[PDB]
Amino acid sequence: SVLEMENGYWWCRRKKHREGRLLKVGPDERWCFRVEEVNWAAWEKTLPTLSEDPSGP
């Protein structure tokens, strides 16, 4: 239903909105999509992240 509503109607055609944001991965710039998960069992800072500061959507 959302894949048929994204096209819009037959008379007028809807604009194609891009999902996510064009971010830079280490320049390997990709269109990405953030999820946010709460894991109470990792506790490991031995993992490289893209950014250093948290940020809202």
Next chain:
Amino acid sequence: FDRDRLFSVVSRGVPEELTGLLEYLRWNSKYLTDSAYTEGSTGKTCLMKAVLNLQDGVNACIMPLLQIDKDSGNPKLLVNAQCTDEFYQGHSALHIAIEKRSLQCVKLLVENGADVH
């Protein structure tokens, strides 16, 4: 001397290039707690950048940076610097050292005047 050179050498963490820093602030009455040396995005102080880019448990240029802002004599202290953003209102470098799960950097922070409240 500019701000981003200080941010690059505090993100790499090597303690040599802060020599020439201290008297430079003493040349122009600057401090490490104003809006000129901290970012206008959130108020990220170079101490907070030092704890955010620590390597293998301890960033080697934190105690030189606390030594420099001990000898320069700021009216508002460096370890009690908090962000002024509406996203980070009150967030200190002690929260970064506790968040990065390192006893050594929070020990170096609270040994040098970090308020714990």
Next chain:
Amino acid sequence: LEEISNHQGLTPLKLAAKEGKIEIFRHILQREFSGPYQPLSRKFTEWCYGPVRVSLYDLSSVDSWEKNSVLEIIAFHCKSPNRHRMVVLEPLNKL
């Protein structure tokens, strides 16, 4: 090697979505590597604060802005009994 199209016009991710093969589809759609071989990853980590963590999934040839996406191929092109089990795995559920 992922962006090579075959004679039907499909990459390996779109072929795993058309053929309905969910285990290789789940593995391609969220794979993370460490150190070297980092540009051939699709699930990155933007930041981590204690327990909360933001994962940046790549949606190159996944969302419907493309002409022949993975979502159009799952919904309209696949003929499998596990066609509904592919729209419930991450990041397609949140998307």
